[PDB]
Amino acid sequence: LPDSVDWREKGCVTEVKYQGSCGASWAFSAVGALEAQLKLKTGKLVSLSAQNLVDCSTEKYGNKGCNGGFMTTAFQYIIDNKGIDSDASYPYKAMDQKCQYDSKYRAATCSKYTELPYGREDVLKEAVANKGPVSVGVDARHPSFFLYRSGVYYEPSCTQNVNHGVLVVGYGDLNGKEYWLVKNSWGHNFGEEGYIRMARNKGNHCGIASFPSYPEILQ
Numbered sequence: 691l692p693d694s695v696d697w698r699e700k701g702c703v704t705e706v707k708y709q710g711s712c713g714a715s716w717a718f719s720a721v722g723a724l725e726a727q728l729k730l731k732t733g734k735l736v737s738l739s740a741q742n743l744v745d746c747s748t749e750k751y752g753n754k755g756c757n758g759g760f761m762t763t764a765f766q767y768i769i770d771n772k773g774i775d776s777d778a779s780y781p782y783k784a785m786d787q788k789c790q791y792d793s794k795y796r797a798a799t800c801s802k803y804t805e806l807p808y809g810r811e812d813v814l815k816e817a818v819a820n821k822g823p824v825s826v827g828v829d830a831r832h833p834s835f836f837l838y839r840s841g842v843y844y845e846p847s848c849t850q851n852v853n854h855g856v857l858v859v860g861y862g863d864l865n866g867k868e869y870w871l872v873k874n875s876w877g878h879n880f881g882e883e884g885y886i887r888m889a890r891n892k893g894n895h896c897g898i899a900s901f902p903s904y905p906e907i908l909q
């Protein structure tokens with residue numbers, strides 16, 4: 691219902707991360723959403739361990755660490771494992787390590803996650819306004835993505851087949867041109883201090899609505 695949202699206004703979005711040479715965007719997209727539920731439920735913002743996901747959410751979850759994975763099964767790992775460690779206690783090293791999860795430093799839980807209908811930007815808007823930041827994949831394979839600096843991103847070559855996990859933390863328009871507020875994991879020097887505004891309501895542009903999902907911390 692709100693014509694614009696931005697979850698950084700309510701202190702639900704941590705600092706932008708730098709995934710480096712490790713292909714772990716699924717891990718960063720996942721913790722990003724669970725961080726936002728953790729501030730909602732408890733009132734505390736704290737970065738969750740991407741390294742935990744990479745090191746421990748593996749073959750049983752269909753993931754391959756720095757060579758790809760999925761945000762959905764990363765949520766299933768957190769459910770199964772009954773927790774996830776803080777970034778502070780389990781820092782990211784942009785490489786594949788042995789699982790070193792320590793329940794002592796558990797910072798967040800997961801009760802469930804929810805996948806959204808393919809391509810439904812109306813339904814995606816609802817979840818971002820009513821439930822919190824939503825994990826999505828995008829097609830980020832195109833040179834314009836890499837060269838993105840600011841403004842509303844539109845790429846007529848863009849397809850609906852996604853290949854890069856990111857986090858939708860809000861939405862709006864730029865003098866009418868509508869967009870999704872996307873947090874990426876390429877450090878603050880990428881985009882708009884780490885963010886990219888990608889075209890919204892342009893037929894699932896770059897497949898931002900192809901496979902959305904978001905976790906929940908239930909009471």
Ligand SMILES: CS(=O)(=O)N1CCc2c(c(-c3ccc(Cl)c(CCc4ccc(Cl)c(CNCc5ccccc5)c4)c3)nn2CCCN2CCOCC2)C1
Nearest residue numbers: 716752758760763826827830831850851852853854855901
């Ligand atoms: C053809 S489809 O695309 O429509 N779709 C097919 C179906 C699908 C996709 C995703 C997805 C959602 C989010 C993301 Cl994040 C991704 C990433 C997939 C991916 C594909 C290709 C490459 Cl190279 C890379 C690696 N990234 C390289 C890269 C880096 C930087 C810029 C650009 C590229 C990643 C896929 N879920 N699902 C549904 C469930 C699939 N399974 C779930 C668990 O197991 C069982 C089945 C992709």
